[PDB]
Amino acid sequence: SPPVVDTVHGKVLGKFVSLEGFAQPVAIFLGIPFAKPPLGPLRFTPPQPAEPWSFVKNATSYPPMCTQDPKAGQLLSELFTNRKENIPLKLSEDCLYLNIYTPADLTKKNRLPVMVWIHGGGLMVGAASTYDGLALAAHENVVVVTIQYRLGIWGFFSTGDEHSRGNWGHLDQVAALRWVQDNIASFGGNPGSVTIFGESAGGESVSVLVLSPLAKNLFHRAISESGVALTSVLVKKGDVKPLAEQIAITAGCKTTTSAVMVHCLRQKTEEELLETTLKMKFLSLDLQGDPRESQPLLGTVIDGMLLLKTPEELQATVPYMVGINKQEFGWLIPMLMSYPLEGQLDQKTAMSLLWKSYPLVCIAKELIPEATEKYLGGTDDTVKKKDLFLDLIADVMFGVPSVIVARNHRDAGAPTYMYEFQYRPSFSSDMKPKTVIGDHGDELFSVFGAPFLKEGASEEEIRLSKMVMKFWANFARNGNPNGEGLPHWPEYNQKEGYLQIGANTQAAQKLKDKEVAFWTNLFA
Amino acid sequence: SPPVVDTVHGKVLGKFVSLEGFAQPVAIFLGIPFAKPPLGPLRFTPPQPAEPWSFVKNATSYPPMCTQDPKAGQLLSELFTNRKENIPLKLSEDCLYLNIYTPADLTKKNRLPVMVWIHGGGLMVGAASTYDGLALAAHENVVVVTIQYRLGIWGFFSTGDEHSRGNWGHLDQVAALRWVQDNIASFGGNPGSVTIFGESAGGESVSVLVLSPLAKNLFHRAISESGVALTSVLVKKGDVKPLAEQIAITAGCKTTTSAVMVHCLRQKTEEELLETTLKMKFLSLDLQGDPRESQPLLGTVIDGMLLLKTPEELQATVPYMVGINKQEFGWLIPMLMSYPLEGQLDQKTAMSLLWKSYPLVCIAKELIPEATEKYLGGTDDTVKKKDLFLDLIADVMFGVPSVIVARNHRDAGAPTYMYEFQYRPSFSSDMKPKTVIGDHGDELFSVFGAPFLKEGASEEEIRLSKMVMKFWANFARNGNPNGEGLPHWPEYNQKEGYLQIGANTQAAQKLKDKEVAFWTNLFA
Amino acid sequence: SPPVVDTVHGKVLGKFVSLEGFAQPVAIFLGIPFAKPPLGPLRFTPPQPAEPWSFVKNATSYPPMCTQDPKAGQLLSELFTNRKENIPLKLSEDCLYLNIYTPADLTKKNRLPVMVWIHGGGLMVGAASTYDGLALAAHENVVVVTIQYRLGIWGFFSTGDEHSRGNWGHLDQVAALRWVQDNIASFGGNPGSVTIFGESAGGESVSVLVLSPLAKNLFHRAISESGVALTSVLVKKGDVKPLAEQIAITAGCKTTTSAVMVHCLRQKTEEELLETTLKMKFLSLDLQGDPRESQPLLGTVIDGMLLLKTPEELQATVPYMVGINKQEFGWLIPMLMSYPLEGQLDQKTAMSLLWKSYPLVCIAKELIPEATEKYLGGTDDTVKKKDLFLDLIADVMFGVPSVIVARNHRDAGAPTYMYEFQYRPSFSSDMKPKTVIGDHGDELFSVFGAPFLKEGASEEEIRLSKMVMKFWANFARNGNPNGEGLPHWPEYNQKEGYLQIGANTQAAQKLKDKEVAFWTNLFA
Ligand SMILES: *[C@@H]1O[C@H](CO)[C@@H](O)[C@H](O)[C@H]1NC(C)=O
Ligand SMILES: *[C@@H]1O[C@H](CO)[C@@H](O)[C@H](O)[C@H]1NC(C)=O
Ligand SMILES: *[C@@H]1O[C@H](CO)[C@@H](O)[C@H](O)[C@H]1NC(C)=O
């Protein structure tokens, strides 16, 4: 008979699922609410606690994903899911749910390390249910929790003042971690041992939670995969009013005051707000006009409740793993953003492209020829220059900020680890050219045990996933990924040792060292 | 000058009305609020206390009745009113009011027994103001309180979970009883002595209040006239989600989650919700398709706040009077539901009709020929078979559940009385054929003293009302209807004595005994 | 390969279907348009010709039925369909289509008699596709055409003046007959030989077409089954303004002038107009208030284009067959109208019921006791009195008007035939009691060959259908139903011979003779 667990708010019923090679089934619970649905007047306000229920709640069907572009959403889900078949999800504003995969013995009080996954998707798209926790939970004996949080307008609308501070989706992430603290023990999890992990906007979310006083003591280790808060495209600093005014005008609202914009947006239906989103054309490199106006998405702001100062100002202490992939801009991102690419580049085109990429990389027009010349100037081949140009964007968006974050964290005295992931999963899209290796998202298939759920993995890819899961879980359990029978992974100290993970797994030193000196010198 | 009374929330002004034969006038107060109007976000939530007022509130005009089909509402009001002329009422969502008839001396502190009336109308229609308390109050010296409660979608919409538990109209009934506890003393009533009474959906409401921990100690005696909670068409058990989804779809709302349905219904106007009600065609026997889909009304659910388990589960202690009429299905009900009836019935037609009557009687198709044969098999006359067929439905809906309720109540040690009312009031509709005697609703004219308010009563009908009022009020005052100069009414003990009331009033024994054995044996 | 026919407006493709016992298949064409869809500004205006099409139109799926109550519509369709399974239809304003069943040899120029069927349903509900023409077409070798026409508000909204004259659904019937004149030859039909036939509102439609100068020469014989125009509930005389004002108010329109009501109704969506229909509660005997206000449906008016004077005024010449069934009010009609019926009746209840039946029978209150006493006064049995009461309504609505129409038609010199149909089809509803014989609609199963399409007919019922089809078709072909091997059917001359059809088929004389003398004497 199926597993039934008592939680503070009432009982929940899930399901037992087996995995070849494990004699104990995993108990799976889908669509557990962790907050009141943020509808009606709750739109653009902090999450409220869920109301209790009097009878058993069924937690056996996937929850809706937060409102978002359903085509971009479905497409990102197919690209990143570790399951055999993608699970088609419904859209809704009622999306504050989490899913739990627990291999514990639910009769006997276990206290397994808890890993709370935060999905990516630029804070605009994405879903928890894309990520099946079964393989990680069963192989490594940890409770996997996948969470959702408000996206896009619903998640990040900000007037830059007290009428709509912003960061609703981050406060959701915080409320899901409070829920874990209060309830995970009934699922066989140790609330005394919670690791947050996430990729891309999810990695940026981990990073913001590492910086935020609201999240202090709701987790004990942190992992950012390909995304941190510092200097990110996902962080909006200075005056955010002009974006709020455009969103309100696009929705047909007056812009007379902040409170007027918020109240009027609060009267719109889900559909009207989705139509507004559609008209703003987020997540597309805008090729027309002055690149300084282009507005690629909504994001984190400095709201004064979750974040008090800019990441850079705070910079000036849990174990923290910060990693990046070898080709962060190799394919997936330029292809989701409609980057204009022949697959070759002369220097002048490269400059115009970089200038157009201003909202992604923020390089002043005066500095464009220098920057371009630095990355492209060593070679003749316009095919290579194209590669070197993709390298440049990757380093600015991901490689440099991640290494700057890791160094500041190390210097503040906390345990720090870094990796650079370099592997071509056999689960890549068929449209992805062979030469792309360690694209954005490539490490998800290892971390989530896709070789144990999907067909066709090579022997090497199977062993790669076992090793990455074991490092991840050893880090969840001990704040140090090392253990018997694994390559040594050095702590990121003054030597800046890091692990190269993938096709040939080995320790190395000084990740992005010369890049960080170059960009830092350039911007200051 | 008119009577003015102080209540917790402020002063109220009513009116003195005289009745031929009493030298003291009765003070009447119409349209006293007992809760905040349940509008806007208060829709589908528990009643809130009324806000206080600073100056005298006028309580001299009838309140609106709860939103409902205005034609079915007006028609039921004319059929059941004990007044000379029916009072045309306005519809509104703002309908949480009660009316008070007090014969007390408002200068001198009286403490009269209080009888709180709960109207019927299938939880879909009905109004307090239909029932004029003047004659009962004056003849028997009791404070009569008629209350309203939310009806239909407004009153009973349930998603089967915490987002819209349901039973809003019952919580209203509870809030009106709290109001009585706190305020009735200023009207000359004893809050230490409150009897609830009601007919049909009103009798079912009394019964639910008898079972509910929320109503404990808000009343001291109970009367159910023709309706109890156990096995009722008015009680919806198991999964109530499919009905909620139909109502939401009919209203043009998405059904993605419970909270989504509730929020969207909360945005509809009163008119849109009335149009939805109209499109669902409640209170009409659906003659097309599979009778197991037919959905005749909304109703009580097991919501976990008012009711914790099914009546049957609880079954497994105030004085309680449970009664039924001789022909519960003789006319009024089949005529309000458009029952298809020639006034004669062969056995095969009877079976098809019973199968179509599934939402009223819930008899499985395999058991239909047995059940039909049991009631119709002793006779040739298809006119009689038609009578016997009406008997069968009455016994299933009213006679058996009432006797099962009374027996369980007796066995739990509480004082229990039963009656079977058999009289043809001269206030029956002109369209009601002569041979119908003790139809559903026939006892209301006695209980409410219609011979003292309307013209044309026979001497016997006049004496019948005096006697019934006196039994009712003796029961309100003592928890035992007996007194000097009345026929003896035996307590319902192991002998199952009950009173036959009407054309020849006398004690008898074993009401519906062989029927209860038959149906119980049949269903188990 | 399937049959393809050229019509004035373009080619149409249908399908071959076989019937056991005929070696030639019948060609069936479903959903042929005969007018422009009456949408947008075409609402409440005369039908316009269909626009031509350039490529083959597929005529192999049932068309939508006109907008109407979908539950009452579906229920009437199941009750009256001659097919094995009822075909669920879509609702739409775009409903001006006809269906054709032709047994002709489409290569070889045939010219078969054409029978154009007009469905009933009180001018409020009904559909062409309910009636499968296959069996009649194949057995009798005629082209069967089933037509649709606008219903309810769409079909009959009238301001009583030139801004919305009314009778839109009748003008539709006329336009379908023009289409037949112009196109039927391509389907193997003789446009020189078109018989109109219809039942109930369909029989009333035939009758109106017999009276109308707009329909002169568009048909050559006529059959009315259970419904004529004279004195009908379906004919609205005098001032029709008050009904138009109620419909406009119910729809939320101002009533300042006729043109204002029409323009505002023309802005409403299909759904809003269906909601208005639902709120007026048509086709239900209204049991409350003064029966002279009750408004049971929309109908034919004297619009000045289709009808110039009242039927009675015109009364003061194609072969015409006028028939009625033995128990026109026995079951189906009182059961669709929620007639309040115990199945027995004392005289005073009978009077109140008759007075309530005013919109059906129009008997002044002063004349009620006389009328009632005339039909019920010969007997004691309240079961019989109930039968005799049903007889009275039937005679007033159907038997007397039909015989008055037939006599006037005879006296004007045209060939006239009458029948009274008395049979209990085995295809009756299971809820229909055994004793009802020749109910309203019972003859449709014979006329449409239901014993050849549905299971279970007795040998007698099979022979009854063959005989009725053959009389109907002999009448279509010759204007005289007689032929070799059939019972003799006398022409309705001064002797008033008519055919009793059913359980024992024989000539008789003087149908409803004493009834016509009684009611005529009563009303004048
Ligand atoms: C829970 O809901 C699922 C739908 O996903 C259903 O199949 C199942 O019967 C439900 N379980 C219980 C115990 O009601
Ligand atoms: C109370 O209102 C009624 C309307 O029902 C009115 O006739 C009366 O004047 C009012 N009484 C006072 C004291 O204002
Ligand atoms: C006509 O439409 C029907 C749908 O009812 C379809 O099955 C058929 O293929 C169509 N015929 C042609 C010739 O396109």
PDB file of N, CA and C in Angstrom, chain B residues 69 71 74 78 271 275 278-279 281 287-288 330 335 338 340-344 346 349 352-353 356 386 390 430-436, chain C residues 69 71 74 78 271 275 278-279 281 288 330 335 338 340-344 346 349 352-353 356 386 390 430-436:
ATOM      1  N   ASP B  69     -32.795  30.929  -7.748  1.00  0.00           N
ATOM      2  CA  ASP B  69     -33.828  31.071  -8.783  1.00  0.00           C
ATOM      3  C   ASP B  69     -35.062  31.810  -8.223  1.00  0.00           C
ATOM      4  N   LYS B  71     -37.959  32.522  -9.514  1.00  0.00           N
ATOM      5  CA  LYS B  71     -39.278  31.958  -9.767  1.00  0.00           C
ATOM      6  C   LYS B  71     -39.503  30.758  -8.855  1.00  0.00           C
ATOM      7  N   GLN B  74     -40.003  32.142  -5.340  1.00  0.00           N
ATOM      8  CA  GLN B  74     -41.267  32.795  -5.074  1.00  0.00           C
ATOM      9  C   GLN B  74     -42.383  31.722  -4.966  1.00  0.00           C
ATOM     10  N   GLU B  78     -44.864  31.028  -1.680  1.00  0.00           N
ATOM     11  CA  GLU B  78     -46.346  31.002  -1.731  1.00  0.00           C
ATOM     12  C   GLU B  78     -46.929  29.701  -1.243  1.00  0.00           C
ATOM     13  N   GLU B 271     -24.981  38.094 -10.762  1.00  0.00           N
ATOM     14  CA  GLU B 271     -25.676  37.685 -11.989  1.00  0.00           C
ATOM     15  C   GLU B 271     -24.982  36.568 -12.732  1.00  0.00           C
ATOM     16  N   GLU B 275     -26.698  32.930 -13.480  1.00  0.00           N
ATOM     17  CA  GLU B 275     -26.741  32.348 -14.821  1.00  0.00           C
ATOM     18  C   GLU B 275     -26.137  30.947 -14.865  1.00  0.00           C
ATOM     19  N   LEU B 278     -28.549  28.640 -13.308  1.00  0.00           N
ATOM     20  CA  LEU B 278     -29.670  28.408 -14.232  1.00  0.00           C
ATOM     21  C   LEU B 278     -29.273  27.343 -15.270  1.00  0.00           C
ATOM     22  N   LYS B 279     -28.049  27.426 -15.773  1.00  0.00           N
ATOM     23  CA  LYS B 279     -27.545  26.461 -16.732  1.00  0.00           C
ATOM     24  C   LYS B 279     -27.315  25.078 -16.191  1.00  0.00           C
ATOM     25  N   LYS B 281     -29.413  23.569 -14.202  1.00  0.00           N
ATOM     26  CA  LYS B 281     -30.779  22.958 -14.064  1.00  0.00           C
ATOM     27  C   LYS B 281     -30.850  22.099 -12.809  1.00  0.00           C
ATOM     28  N   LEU B 287     -34.043  13.435 -17.259  1.00  0.00           N
ATOM     29  CA  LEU B 287     -34.668  12.216 -17.798  1.00  0.00           C
ATOM     30  C   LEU B 287     -33.801  11.545 -18.902  1.00  0.00           C
ATOM     31  N   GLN B 288     -32.673  12.185 -19.206  1.00  0.00           N
ATOM     32  CA  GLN B 288     -31.810  11.815 -20.308  1.00  0.00           C
ATOM     33  C   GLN B 288     -30.497  11.214 -19.808  1.00  0.00           C
ATOM     34  N   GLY B 330     -46.149  12.841  -1.900  1.00  0.00           N
ATOM     35  CA  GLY B 330     -47.468  12.770  -2.521  1.00  0.00           C
ATOM     36  C   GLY B 330     -47.752  13.738  -3.650  1.00  0.00           C
ATOM     37  N   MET B 335     -44.064  17.383  -8.125  1.00  0.00           N
ATOM     38  CA  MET B 335     -44.529  18.503  -8.937  1.00  0.00           C
ATOM     39  C   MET B 335     -43.379  19.523  -9.014  1.00  0.00           C
ATOM     40  N   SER B 338     -40.684  18.263 -11.525  1.00  0.00           N
ATOM     41  CA  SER B 338     -41.081  17.781 -12.862  1.00  0.00           C
ATOM     42  C   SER B 338     -41.001  16.250 -13.023  1.00  0.00           C
ATOM     43  N   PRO B 340     -42.088  12.838 -14.106  1.00  0.00           N
ATOM     44  CA  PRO B 340     -42.919  12.470 -15.251  1.00  0.00           C
ATOM     45  C   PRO B 340     -44.142  11.574 -14.877  1.00  0.00           C
ATOM     46  N   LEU B 341     -45.316  12.179 -14.700  1.00  0.00           N
ATOM     47  CA  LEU B 341     -46.506  11.431 -14.282  1.00  0.00           C
ATOM     48  C   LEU B 341     -47.802  12.054 -14.841  1.00  0.00           C
ATOM     49  N   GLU B 342     -49.711  10.840 -16.007  1.00  0.00           N
ATOM     50  CA  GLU B 342     -50.768   9.862 -16.252  1.00  0.00           C
ATOM     51  C   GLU B 342     -51.429   9.398 -14.988  1.00  0.00           C
ATOM     52  N   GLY B 343     -50.623   9.413 -13.940  1.00  0.00           N
ATOM     53  CA  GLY B 343     -51.071   8.988 -12.636  1.00  0.00           C
ATOM     54  C   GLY B 343     -51.399   7.528 -12.536  1.00  0.00           C
ATOM     55  N   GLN B 344     -50.799   6.742 -13.406  1.00  0.00           N
ATOM     56  CA  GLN B 344     -50.822   5.290 -13.226  1.00  0.00           C
ATOM     57  C   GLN B 344     -49.514   4.664 -13.691  1.00  0.00           C
ATOM     58  N   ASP B 346     -47.567   0.760 -14.490  1.00  0.00           N
ATOM     59  CA  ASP B 346     -47.309  -0.671 -14.628  1.00  0.00           C
ATOM     60  C   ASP B 346     -45.931  -0.882 -14.083  1.00  0.00           C
ATOM     61  N   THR B 349     -42.564   0.338 -16.174  1.00  0.00           N
ATOM     62  CA  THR B 349     -42.417   1.785 -16.177  1.00  0.00           C
ATOM     63  C   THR B 349     -41.933   2.192 -14.797  1.00  0.00           C
ATOM     64  N   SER B 352     -38.212   1.709 -14.558  1.00  0.00           N
ATOM     65  CA  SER B 352     -37.440   2.701 -15.313  1.00  0.00           C
ATOM     66  C   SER B 352     -37.471   4.000 -14.575  1.00  0.00           C
ATOM     67  N   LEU B 353     -38.629   4.352 -14.018  1.00  0.00           N
ATOM     68  CA  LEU B 353     -38.740   5.576 -13.247  1.00  0.00           C
ATOM     69  C   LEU B 353     -37.811   5.552 -11.997  1.00  0.00           C
ATOM     70  N   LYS B 356     -34.398   6.004 -13.014  1.00  0.00           N
ATOM     71  CA  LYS B 356     -34.150   7.425 -13.279  1.00  0.00           C
ATOM     72  C   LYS B 356     -34.066   8.223 -11.988  1.00  0.00           C
ATOM     73  N   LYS B 386     -49.171   3.273  -8.423  1.00  0.00           N
ATOM     74  CA  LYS B 386     -48.588   4.585  -8.531  1.00  0.00           C
ATOM     75  C   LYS B 386     -48.446   5.168  -7.136  1.00  0.00           C
ATOM     76  N   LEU B 390     -45.051   6.012  -4.995  1.00  0.00           N
ATOM     77  CA  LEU B 390     -44.712   7.290  -4.335  1.00  0.00           C
ATOM     78  C   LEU B 390     -44.275   7.015  -2.870  1.00  0.00           C
ATOM     79  N   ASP B 430     -54.509  25.033  -4.718  1.00  0.00           N
ATOM     80  CA  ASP B 430     -55.685  24.557  -5.523  1.00  0.00           C
ATOM     81  C   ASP B 430     -55.334  23.464  -6.551  1.00  0.00           C
ATOM     82  N   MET B 431     -54.101  23.452  -7.050  1.00  0.00           N
ATOM     83  CA  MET B 431     -53.701  22.365  -7.960  1.00  0.00           C
ATOM     84  C   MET B 431     -53.401  21.000  -7.320  1.00  0.00           C
ATOM     85  N   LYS B 432     -53.460  20.952  -5.985  1.00  0.00           N
ATOM     86  CA  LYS B 432     -53.161  19.753  -5.257  1.00  0.00           C
ATOM     87  C   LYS B 432     -54.435  18.906  -5.150  1.00  0.00           C
ATOM     88  N   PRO B 433     -54.362  17.680  -5.650  1.00  0.00           N
ATOM     89  CA  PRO B 433     -55.556  16.846  -5.716  1.00  0.00           C
ATOM     90  C   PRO B 433     -55.968  16.514  -4.286  1.00  0.00           C
ATOM     91  N   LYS B 434     -57.281  16.393  -4.078  1.00  0.00           N
ATOM     92  CA  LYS B 434     -57.947  16.025  -2.806  1.00  0.00           C
ATOM     93  C   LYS B 434     -57.369  14.814  -2.070  1.00  0.00           C
ATOM     94  N   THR B 435     -57.048  13.744  -2.786  1.00  0.00           N
ATOM     95  CA  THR B 435     -56.588  12.523  -2.124  1.00  0.00           C
ATOM     96  C   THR B 435     -55.194  12.639  -1.418  1.00  0.00           C
ATOM     97  N   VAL B 436     -54.442  13.703  -1.676  1.00  0.00           N
ATOM     98  CA  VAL B 436     -53.128  13.812  -0.997  1.00  0.00           C
ATOM     99  C   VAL B 436     -53.329  14.280   0.423  1.00  0.00           C
TER     100      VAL B 436
ATOM    101  N   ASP C  69     -32.280  25.505 -26.315  1.00  0.00           N
ATOM    102  CA  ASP C  69     -31.904  24.742 -25.117  1.00  0.00           C
ATOM    103  C   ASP C  69     -31.362  23.350 -25.506  1.00  0.00           C
ATOM    104  N   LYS C  71     -30.416  20.797 -23.731  1.00  0.00           N
ATOM    105  CA  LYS C  71     -30.929  19.631 -23.023  1.00  0.00           C
ATOM    106  C   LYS C  71     -32.326  19.299 -23.532  1.00  0.00           C
ATOM    107  N   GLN C  74     -31.893  17.853 -27.031  1.00  0.00           N
ATOM    108  CA  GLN C  74     -31.360  16.509 -27.115  1.00  0.00           C
ATOM    109  C   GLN C  74     -32.452  15.498 -26.676  1.00  0.00           C
ATOM    110  N   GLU C  78     -34.018  12.372 -28.958  1.00  0.00           N
ATOM    111  CA  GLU C  78     -34.066  10.953 -28.528  1.00  0.00           C
ATOM    112  C   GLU C  78     -35.462  10.386 -28.525  1.00  0.00           C
ATOM    113  N   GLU C 271     -24.396  33.157 -27.195  1.00  0.00           N
ATOM    114  CA  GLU C 271     -24.497  32.816 -25.770  1.00  0.00           C
ATOM    115  C   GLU C 271     -25.371  33.762 -24.982  1.00  0.00           C
ATOM    116  N   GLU C 275     -28.740  32.599 -22.973  1.00  0.00           N
ATOM    117  CA  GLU C 275     -28.964  32.931 -21.566  1.00  0.00           C
ATOM    118  C   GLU C 275     -30.292  33.647 -21.342  1.00  0.00           C
ATOM    119  N   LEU C 278     -32.977  31.143 -21.635  1.00  0.00           N
ATOM    120  CA  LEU C 278     -32.994  30.301 -20.429  1.00  0.00           C
ATOM    121  C   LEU C 278     -33.750  31.027 -19.302  1.00  0.00           C
ATOM    122  N   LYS C 279     -33.512  32.324 -19.162  1.00  0.00           N
ATOM    123  CA  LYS C 279     -34.189  33.125 -18.160  1.00  0.00           C
ATOM    124  C   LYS C 279     -35.659  33.339 -18.393  1.00  0.00           C
ATOM    125  N   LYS C 281     -37.673  30.965 -19.362  1.00  0.00           N
ATOM    126  CA  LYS C 281     -38.333  29.665 -18.998  1.00  0.00           C
ATOM    127  C   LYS C 281     -39.484  29.369 -19.950  1.00  0.00           C
ATOM    128  N   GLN C 288     -47.488  30.006 -11.115  1.00  0.00           N
ATOM    129  CA  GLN C 288     -47.545  31.138 -10.212  1.00  0.00           C
ATOM    130  C   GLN C 288     -48.221  32.339 -10.871  1.00  0.00           C
ATOM    131  N   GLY C 330     -51.577  12.770 -24.064  1.00  0.00           N
ATOM    132  CA  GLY C 330     -51.520  11.649 -23.130  1.00  0.00           C
ATOM    133  C   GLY C 330     -50.304  11.561 -22.232  1.00  0.00           C
ATOM    134  N   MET C 335     -45.554  15.882 -19.850  1.00  0.00           N
ATOM    135  CA  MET C 335     -44.277  15.529 -19.240  1.00  0.00           C
ATOM    136  C   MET C 335     -43.243  16.570 -19.705  1.00  0.00           C
ATOM    137  N   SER C 338     -43.757  19.888 -17.734  1.00  0.00           N
ATOM    138  CA  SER C 338     -43.893  19.868 -16.265  1.00  0.00           C
ATOM    139  C   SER C 338     -45.331  20.117 -15.767  1.00  0.00           C
ATOM    140  N   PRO C 340     -48.381  19.623 -13.658  1.00  0.00           N
ATOM    141  CA  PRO C 340     -48.466  19.127 -12.286  1.00  0.00           C
ATOM    142  C   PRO C 340     -49.457  17.932 -12.111  1.00  0.00           C
ATOM    143  N   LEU C 341     -48.946  16.702 -12.123  1.00  0.00           N
ATOM    144  CA  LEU C 341     -49.804  15.516 -12.034  1.00  0.00           C
ATOM    145  C   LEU C 341     -49.091  14.343 -11.330  1.00  0.00           C
ATOM    146  N   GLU C 342     -50.014  12.884  -9.461  1.00  0.00           N
ATOM    147  CA  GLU C 342     -50.924  12.006  -8.729  1.00  0.00           C
ATOM    148  C   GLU C 342     -51.710  11.103  -9.634  1.00  0.00           C
ATOM    149  N   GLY C 343     -51.942  11.630 -10.823  1.00  0.00           N
ATOM    150  CA  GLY C 343     -52.695  10.921 -11.830  1.00  0.00           C
ATOM    151  C   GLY C 343     -54.139  10.707 -11.490  1.00  0.00           C
ATOM    152  N   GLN C 344     -54.665  11.565 -10.639  1.00  0.00           N
ATOM    153  CA  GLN C 344     -56.114  11.626 -10.454  1.00  0.00           C
ATOM    154  C   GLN C 344     -56.569  13.057 -10.200  1.00  0.00           C
ATOM    155  N   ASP C 346     -60.094  15.472  -9.010  1.00  0.00           N
ATOM    156  CA  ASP C 346     -61.437  15.879  -8.602  1.00  0.00           C
ATOM    157  C   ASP C 346     -61.746  17.099  -9.413  1.00  0.00           C
ATOM    158  N   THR C 349     -59.953  20.750  -8.601  1.00  0.00           N
ATOM    159  CA  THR C 349     -58.549  20.766  -8.983  1.00  0.00           C
ATOM    160  C   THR C 349     -58.495  20.868 -10.497  1.00  0.00           C
ATOM    161  N   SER C 352     -58.933  24.451 -11.550  1.00  0.00           N
ATOM    162  CA  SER C 352     -57.763  25.292 -11.277  1.00  0.00           C
ATOM    163  C   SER C 352     -56.695  24.971 -12.272  1.00  0.00           C
ATOM    164  N   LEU C 353     -56.524  23.687 -12.584  1.00  0.00           N
ATOM    165  CA  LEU C 353     -55.540  23.288 -13.572  1.00  0.00           C
ATOM    166  C   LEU C 353     -55.857  23.889 -14.974  1.00  0.00           C
ATOM    167  N   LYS C 356     -55.079  27.393 -14.996  1.00  0.00           N
ATOM    168  CA  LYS C 356     -53.632  27.573 -15.152  1.00  0.00           C
ATOM    169  C   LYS C 356     -53.187  27.274 -16.574  1.00  0.00           C
ATOM    170  N   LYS C 386     -59.245  12.247 -14.890  1.00  0.00           N
ATOM    171  CA  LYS C 386     -57.934  12.722 -15.251  1.00  0.00           C
ATOM    172  C   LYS C 386     -57.722  12.474 -16.734  1.00  0.00           C
ATOM    173  N   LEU C 390     -57.368  15.169 -19.805  1.00  0.00           N
ATOM    174  CA  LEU C 390     -56.291  15.227 -20.816  1.00  0.00           C
ATOM    175  C   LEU C 390     -56.919  15.322 -22.234  1.00  0.00           C
ATOM    176  N   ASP C 430     -39.276   4.299 -22.223  1.00  0.00           N
ATOM    177  CA  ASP C 430     -39.560   3.396 -21.056  1.00  0.00           C
ATOM    178  C   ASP C 430     -40.348   4.077 -19.920  1.00  0.00           C
ATOM    179  N   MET C 431     -40.203   5.390 -19.763  1.00  0.00           N
ATOM    180  CA  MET C 431     -41.013   6.090 -18.751  1.00  0.00           C
ATOM    181  C   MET C 431     -42.488   6.345 -19.100  1.00  0.00           C
ATOM    182  N   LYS C 432     -42.875   5.972 -20.324  1.00  0.00           N
ATOM    183  CA  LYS C 432     -44.212   6.192 -20.795  1.00  0.00           C
ATOM    184  C   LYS C 432     -45.089   5.008 -20.368  1.00  0.00           C
ATOM    185  N   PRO C 433     -46.145   5.305 -19.624  1.00  0.00           N
ATOM    186  CA  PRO C 433     -46.964   4.240 -19.059  1.00  0.00           C
ATOM    187  C   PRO C 433     -47.658   3.527 -20.215  1.00  0.00           C
ATOM    188  N   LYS C 434     -47.860   2.219 -20.047  1.00  0.00           N
ATOM    189  CA  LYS C 434     -48.555   1.302 -20.981  1.00  0.00           C
ATOM    190  C   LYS C 434     -49.899   1.789 -21.527  1.00  0.00           C
ATOM    191  N   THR C 435     -50.744   2.365 -20.681  1.00  0.00           N
ATOM    192  CA  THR C 435     -52.081   2.758 -21.126  1.00  0.00           C
ATOM    193  C   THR C 435     -52.115   3.926 -22.169  1.00  0.00           C
ATOM    194  N   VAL C 436     -51.002   4.623 -22.374  1.00  0.00           N
ATOM    195  CA  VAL C 436     -51.038   5.721 -23.370  1.00  0.00           C
ATOM    196  C   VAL C 436     -50.951   5.145 -24.762  1.00  0.00           C
TER     197      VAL C 436
END
